[PDB]
């Protein structure tokens, strides 16, 4: 039972390195949108 539960966070660890990218892209769209709307 604990082998099957433990291999689910290690497949998801691949998605967690993508989630640090997707969360840094969303914050930078907010900076560039207030700036683009003034120009």
């Amino acid at each position: 039972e604990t082998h099957e539960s433990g291999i689910k966070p290690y497949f998801e660890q691949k998605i967690q390195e993508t989630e640090l990218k997707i969360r840094s892209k969303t914050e930078n769209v907010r900076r560039l949108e207030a700036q683009r709307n003034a120009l």
Partner: protein, 33 residues
């Protein structure tokens, strides 16, 4: 618990495919400004 974890494992790959198109839109509004 094995039925609902399997739907999450497939779903989540198709949902990241979409957010790879939103990361291209952010790059070219740097060039545009």
């Amino acid at each position: 618990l094995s039925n609902v974890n399997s739907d999450i494992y497939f779903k989540l790959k198709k949902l990241e495919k979409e957010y790879e198109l939103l990361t291209l839109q952010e790059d070219y509004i740097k060039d545009e400004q």
